[PDB]
Structure 1
């Protein structure tokens, strides 16, 4: 909708909102990111610290699939059970029949330990876990199986 723009409102006004002294020009301060060390230095150092310079090791031919390790927390662990089938495990929270929660199938690599799971034994299968996540799971009465 070009009828709602201020260009339609600036018709009849000489400078079109650009001033009579400033006199809207092509590129008064340079093109793109020019002068970031010279005359845009104050802006760059204030709002973009760390832009110039180098940081640590290069990685030739980085494949992001090597570093695939999505994180699932303990407070989201029980969501991997279907909702209709979830509550029937909360009741009768018993040993010798515990839900198996394969997090790799759901798309997760590592489990962390946000915590406060209900005290229900659950078998948890994951590529990686954290120390506190395993402590909380085994305290609730479950166990972690490592898979690959």
Structure 2
């Protein structure tokens, strides 16, 4: 499926050594096998390029459950793309007929973070968890966050 016509086995026919030198030509494992020895003769290669290899920074969680730190998040940055496409500007008549009741647990999201630059319209967001700046820019525009599961 791969070429070989473009591979270099086909260009080294027939030059003697096949890419590898007269002198210290291709032998089986001349530094060892795999990640060994990372503290001895491959020391420099493991720091640089991999610092933080060899040690132990700690707290052993026997049986992590990744269904505990789940929390899908969403910035204020988007947040208006969730409500449909033409209500974007159909409310900026100007006519404040609408704070959109958004429920993020029906959109798969659990926290509302706040990176934002949000517009001046009210919303009614219903996330599980809060960012503090999220609830400080939605209150600044006449909105809520209904603290709901």
The TM-score bracket by the shorter chain reads: over 0.9
Query: Residue 121 of structure 2 aligns with which residue?
Result: 120
Matched, 1:137 2:138: yes
The answer to whether the 8 A contact 1:89-1:99 is kept is no
Return the TM-score normalized by structure 2: 0.92
Query: Residue 40 of structure 1 aligns with which residue?
Result: 42
Partner SS, residue 125 of structure 2: strand
What is the deviation of 1:20? 0.9
Query: Residue 11 of structure 2 aligns with which residue?
Result: 9
Moved over 2 A (4+): 84-93
Residue 56 of structure 1 is aligned with which of 58, 65, 69? 58
Partner SS, residue 81 of structure 2: helix
Uncovered stretches (5+) of structure 1, i.e. residues with no partner = none
What is the deviation of 1:89? 3.5
Query: Residue 68 of structure 1 aligns with which residue?
Result: 70
Q: CA RMSD in A?
A: 1.4
Partner SS, residue 4 of structure 1: coil
How far apart in 2 are the matches of 1:134 and 1:116?
13
Query: Residue 84 of structure 1 aligns with which residue?
Result: 86
Aligned length: 147
What is the deviation of 1:46? 0.8
How far apart in 2 are the matches of 1:6 and 1:55?
45
Uncovered stretches (5+) of structure 2, i.e. residues with no partner = none
- Give the helix-richer structure, 1 or 2: 1
How far apart in 2 are the matches of 1:6 and 1:51?
35
What is the deviation of 1:76? 1.0
